[PDB]
Write a structure and sequence with these properties.
part of a larger assembly, 8 chains, A alpha+beta (249), B alpha+beta (244), C alpha+beta (241), D alpha+beta (222), E alpha+beta (244), F alpha+beta (196), G alpha+beta (204), H alpha+beta (232), F: alpha+beta, Glutamine Phosphoribosylpyrophosphate, subunit 1, domain 1, five-stranded antiparallel beta sheet, 5 helices, globular, H: 232 residues, 6 helices, 10 strands, 33% helix, 26% strand, binds the ligand COc1cc(/C=C/CCCN2CCCN(CCC/C=C/c3cc(OC)c(OC)c(OC)c3)CC2)cc(OC)c1OC, proteasome (chain B), acetylation (chain B), Probable proteasome subunit alpha type-7 (chain B), cytoplasm (chain B)
Amino acid sequence: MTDRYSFSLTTFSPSGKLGQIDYALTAVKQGVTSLGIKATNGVVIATEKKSSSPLAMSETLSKVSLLTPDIGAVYSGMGPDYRVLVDKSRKVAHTSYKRIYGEYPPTKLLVSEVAKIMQEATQSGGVRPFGVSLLIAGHDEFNGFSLYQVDPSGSYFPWKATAIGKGSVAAKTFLEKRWNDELELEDAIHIALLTLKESVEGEFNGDTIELAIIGDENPDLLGYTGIPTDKGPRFRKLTSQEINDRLEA
Amino acid sequence: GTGYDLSNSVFSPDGRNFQVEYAVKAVENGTTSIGIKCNDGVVFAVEKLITSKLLVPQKNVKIQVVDRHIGCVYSGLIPDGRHLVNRGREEAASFKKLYKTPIPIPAFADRLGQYVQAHTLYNSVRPFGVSTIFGGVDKNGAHLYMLEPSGSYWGYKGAATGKGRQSAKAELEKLVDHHPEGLSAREAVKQAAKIIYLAHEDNKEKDFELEISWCSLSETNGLHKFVKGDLLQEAIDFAQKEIN
Amino acid sequence: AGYDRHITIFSPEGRLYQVEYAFKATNQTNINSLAVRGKDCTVVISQKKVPDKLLDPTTVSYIFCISRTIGMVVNGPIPDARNAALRAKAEAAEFRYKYGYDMPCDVLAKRMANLSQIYTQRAYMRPLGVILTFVSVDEELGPSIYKTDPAGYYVGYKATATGPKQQEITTNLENHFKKSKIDHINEESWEKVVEFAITHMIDALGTEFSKNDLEVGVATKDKFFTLSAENIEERLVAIAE
Amino acid sequence: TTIVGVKFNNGVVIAADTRSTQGPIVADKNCAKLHRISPKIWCAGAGTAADTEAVTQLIGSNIELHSLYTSREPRVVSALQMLKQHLFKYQGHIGAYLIVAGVDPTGSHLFSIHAHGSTDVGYYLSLGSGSLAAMAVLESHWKQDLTKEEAIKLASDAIQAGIWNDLGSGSNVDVCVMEIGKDAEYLRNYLTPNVREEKQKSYKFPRGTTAVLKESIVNICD
Amino acid sequence: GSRRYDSRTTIFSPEGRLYQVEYALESISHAGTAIGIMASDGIVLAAERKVTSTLLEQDTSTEKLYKLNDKIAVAVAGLTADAEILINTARIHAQNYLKTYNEDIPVEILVRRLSDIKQGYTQHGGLRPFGVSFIYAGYDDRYGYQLYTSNPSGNYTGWKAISVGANTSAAQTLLQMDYKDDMKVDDAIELALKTLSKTTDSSALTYDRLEFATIRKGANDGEVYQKIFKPQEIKDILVKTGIT
Amino acid sequence: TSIMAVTFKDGVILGADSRTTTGAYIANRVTDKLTRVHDKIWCCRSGSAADTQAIADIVQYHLELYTSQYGTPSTETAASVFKELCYENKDNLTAGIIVAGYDDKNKGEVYTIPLGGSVHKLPYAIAGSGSTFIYGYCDKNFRENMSKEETVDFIKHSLSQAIKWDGSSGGVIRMVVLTAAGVERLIFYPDEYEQL
Amino acid sequence: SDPSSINGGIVVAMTGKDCVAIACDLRLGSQSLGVSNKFEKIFHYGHVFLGITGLATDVTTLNEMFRYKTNLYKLKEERAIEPETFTQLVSSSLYERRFGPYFVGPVVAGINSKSGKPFIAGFDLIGCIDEAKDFIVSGTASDQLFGMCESLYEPNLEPEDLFETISQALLNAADRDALSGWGAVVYIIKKDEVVKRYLKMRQD
Amino acid sequence: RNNYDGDTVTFSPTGRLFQVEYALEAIKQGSVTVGLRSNTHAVLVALKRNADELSSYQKKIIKCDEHMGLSLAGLAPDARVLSNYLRQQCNYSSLVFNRKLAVERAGHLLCDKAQKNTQSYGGRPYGVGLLIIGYDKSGAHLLEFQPSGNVTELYGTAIGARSQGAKTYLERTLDTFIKIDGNPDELIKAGVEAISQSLRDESLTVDNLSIAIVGKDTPFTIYDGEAVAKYI
Ligand SMILES: COc1cc(/C=C/CCCN2CCCN(CCC/C=C/c3cc(OC)c(OC)c(OC)c3)CC2)cc(OC)c1OC
Ligand SMILES: COc1cc(/C=C/CCCN2CCCN(CCC/C=C/c3cc(OC)c(OC)c(OC)c3)CC2)cc(OC)c1OC
């Protein structure tokens, strides 16, 4: 182990482009579609589980990850970059927030921490950037519900709703048309389901798509009763059944 | 495009590592050396090219011992081979130190194997320009191994490498056929001297000096020892009878 | 063209050539393996080829016993295969020490996948030219097959195969499960689950095997083990009916 | 401080008293000494209270991350191995004395861990300055195959042994029950046998009774 | 070796220019323009957003105006995430100075420090420079109201008015035309709006493409208020100043 | 505490009382001092419980890693990992350990590792605080190649005397039998060994 | 020799109906020698009030440190820190120095701006949290303070009353401690406003 | 164009290390030096090379211990580094084990030390060749060291410019000088002879001649100037 690569691998080109950030974004463009939508009483996040063999068990691979009990992520791009990124993001929510304030971070701050991790990989010695874009959805007490997109550059922005990956321009367009500020969480799941139907080729059921919400508190997911201040996680991933049920619609 | 063969850890588009393959060319340009696994031990022999009458016999020893029970011999870039033995020695000491029992041969093989492999992982180093034939007797009997610059190694009934290696393999293949029951320690040395002699023809324009060593349960108490004096000359004379 | 073809940085199309090229290194052994799940066991079978009469046939293996409960089969050149095993072995012991329980198959896989992915992101290191297939009867999950590649991907398989002739075996198995409607080989005996796996191996590959041509690993409840030539022979007899 | 843990047929219960002391002074007459490591693994602590809190929240956090990473429910045997290896590192300078109880997919568990890093396993355990009173009661009334309700009674009484008989223990009884197929049940002030009696007077002062030199409203907001 | 892959981010061109700094500056010209204008009774910061969608949440958005401290704000042009890391650093430096001296850090000191980190990347490290240019609006008791800018090179300068990013020369010419020292804040507000609508490569200036902040006194306190404008407050001034 | 390991014809048996004490207070009366570091390699622990649990945990880890690389470790090797940890950390350990195990090549083996980090291969080994009282007894009663029943009795009697005299010992007598047949756990209660 | 006893001083906090109060003495001394009569031990960060007793150089350092930290908090979070969150920040900060601690006894008081509920807490010098709902005491007259509080305190006192109560608790307890006194300040705290009064007391 | 010679980490497709081979070239340009041995002694004769006619002739012989020394041909700062490192290894053998380092073992150390410089990025091989003479517990010894890492034991050899003259002269003289036991001056005469078979134009001066002798009851000693006159 003699890492001699202590110089940037992203450098400015004469035009002013960051080559490796662009190519990274290009890898994101090629990845499967995922989307998020914000209602008044929740946020939904959706994506297509594209099975790489029917011999593969797709329940062994969630594409939607819990970060804190009030925050979930979904991505489009390279999987193993997302996997790693989720681990690191769970840990900074502890090391840099939980272990200091006894609370989990608010959506913006965890996002910002994620952004920082990604920014570092577009500047530090001997690394390429990440080739994912994440949509991060969440709730907190003073900010309420939010939904953030974070790009390989480390840049992030809040959305009323948006999509990333293949049919990001189509889906985005479809979302502006159906989005108002009076949407209920149940309406946004419906919209997300539709938006996904477009970019999905083959079978479209509760086994080929993946949905999660940041909604109300689920004390049935807490695991203990006693403290009346702890009400349970607002993140909930949906089952095959709940997806299929909403499909009769 | 092109230039996949300039840096050490680079996969070519067909999934190969050209620098390793180049290192192998340095092995092939080496003198030939072999190992014969008998029924209770292993013999090691090697070709020592006599460039001039100025050399001293038999004072340029190539076979090396690791710990007390392991013989190593190699073909190719020699200083690379010593560097590898050095690492084998530290590794075998470290093993004995902690586990008390002297290192078993497969354990020891893997130690060099992981370390050779390691030099095919970064562009900060080059692979080892040597193939190494080594072995001895552990608690589980006799073991013979050969180790390539890629980190590849396997157990052998007999092994050869370097210049005269294909004559040698044909010779070892023959013995493997006629003796499916086992070669004896004393026979394996005589036979080993023949094969070096035979393999010397790829190099016939220079004179050669012979080296043999054995680790044998019944002939050396499982300790690695060199063939010297009478026993050596007895095997030289056997060789010079079989070439006529 | 470019250096973007020599190290693990993005090409303008957003791809990593070194990753793709490493996937090619996996095949240069021309060894095929499949894995299958029984009721309470898990079987890997891989081709054994000893091209040289001078080799010791007992030393030629691409099945590794990682822990008491985890076996790993490797499609790729042995130097990289051994490097990976050594890690997994080291990584699974440490796990146990730190956390007081045996490392789960899926988890060791997630670990090795993460190490793999860092090689795709850091320039000083090359990926390894191997595809790793992990098997066990997990104490919480039941029989498990988990595979990782040099991209850093990892998946849960109901059955799987790997090698040059991978696609043959794969479709063969896809078809068997399409009729079966169950995600495993409905058999209580691990030796009838080995026989099954040697059978479908035979069809897809269109070839016959002697006892020296296969390698077999079995993973039961709290044991993973490899069959000898003779335990294999015993299956090879019983199949020929 | 008195803390106990009792195994019963389908789970495990831990109990503690609610008294925090600084020397001979009672600083909190209702301290919660039952800590959460994971939702179904709980802890009672005795020793330096900053340490018992510090160590359960740390191992608590690592346990959560391990859980998310392996996608498995946390195991007691893990919180044990992690606690004890942290404690051992610090040669007892981390003065945490701990009874760790929980249910996981392998069953129900009860351990004690000492500041120096030694661990014990049993069906009933106690620690604290009330350790002895409590263990006398447990040695007197324990049997195998306790019902849930029996094991609460037992653990509850043992704490009372320390509340009454030990000067270092006092006030209320906190209990947590974790049963194999159910949510951990946490009973804050399960028992409150120590209510203060009504004062013989009210000590409200007539307003103006305090002598003041200066007033000034304070600027909260910039 | 690995030497071949090094772009050498930190060397001179034969003109004595820093390749990467110039290339970074070229990157910054593609970023939404920001304006700082300093009046007798305060400072104005206006900037146009690169990112626009009807679905972009703007109540909770920020890419241009950041608070460093209660006396100092900064307007950004370039890599948002590159600016984010420099910003954080600068917040810490302001607090470190406060902890040390028990006074709020004077604007220039905070600017020099941040500029000096920037310059460091241009002389050692082999790392790409930060793709960021800042305008700093601030107030201390030595120099009153102040404007400064810094760019990837490490250079900073002081200004009565200035702009960074896209169409800077246009903007630098339009400001230099109509700026006077007697400018009041309500005046400076208008001029910065006027300049942005005459530079924008977009159809017009809507409230949703704008970030806007003012550092003044509250007429009652002799104290320093930093007001960042909400979307509805920005729309107010667009109707007001007559851009509807 | 009182601990011993004795070799016999068919293998080796480890024994121990079950009392750990903090001063005069019996902190634990059902302690398990017989500790598995491998399938057929066990140890008797005495000294600091923390030091001694931690050492065993590390040795368990080492031999497990050994096993996956080089197959089954010798009893002698288990003893070596122990000695190495105890000797090189002699300033910060209070551990006295008897290592015992079974091979088919080697049969039963016993190594004692005392406070030194010295290591000693013995036909039998006593240790712990209760051990002093039975030095004479055991020297008069150990015979080599005893039967399993003989050996279980030799340990029963010795340990009942050690428990009788040493107040640091007591509770139950635990044994672990290591033979080719495998691994057998035995227990003996007060009412049984007291009246011997 | 005892770092928590070189400088002297006390802090008491109290919760009443829709209010909280926090008080401290003004003394700073070196052992027997009275140095300053103006050393206050109650600081605030936004609407969170923190009282510190103990070694004076640490009281100072800790205040500077919590200013620094609550500044970066407001900057990143865009809101003022709440009492419960702060209390956690104090605890984790003191524990950072577990084997070389700051020689102080901190006390937090305030009103949650969202939940409205009054809040007080106390800690030892390494961060263990006293989570009491009635009163928290700290310093060299912490014993006297306990005795006075247990008697004088009744719950749900209106601000005007709670002021009388907390002042009398502080005053008499400081008069039974050689190392405390020389003046006093009381903060009455509500959601709307915070009043600060300096008490008159014997100057010996 | 050669793509395979820009550092030592790179093998050529024929399996060669060009950077090592370019180092060897420095030696072959260095001034000639000759070593030879009987069963009792071992002599180093070296032709020193001046720059101008106003310059000193550069010292080609270095003592490493009382029983061992070398001559250098090539990049001399490197010979300083290697001879220095060998001085230490001799020292260490004497201090720790009270034992004179066997000549054969000095060779091993130099070899392993040279090899490391042929396998790592940023490094560069040694640009010097060495002739090692010593008398240890196994009698007289002569070693030749090349920066490749190769060390070989011989009765005689020469390295540097025109070395082949001496080299062949030694091959014919072999059976003659191998018998010069007990007479150093006869062993040196043979050594100073041989070095003349590499003398193209200039002849041995009392200023360009350098000579070292070691053996049975003779510690390594260096003769230059007046002391060397009697052999020329
Ligand atoms: C030198 O070698 C020896 C050492 C010993 C052992 C001496 C002392 C034993 C160890 N301990 C001493 C006693 C103290 N201890 C603490 C256990 C639990 C503390 C309960 C507790 C009490 C409190 O109030 C005081 C608490 O509130 C602060 C609290 O926190 C919640 C917890 C455990 C450890 C005994 C020996 O034989 C006779 C001996 O041989 C010569
Ligand atoms: C069974 O578990 C336990 C283990 C232990 C701990 C056992 C360790 C004993 C510690 N030592 C006793 C053994 C002996 N010892 C040193 C010997 C003293 C003689 C002084 C001496 C000094 C020298 O230094 C110069 C010598 O060299 C010349 C020398 O010549 C032999 C002798 C010191 C240390 C204690 C227990 O409680 C009672 C216990 O019961 C639960």
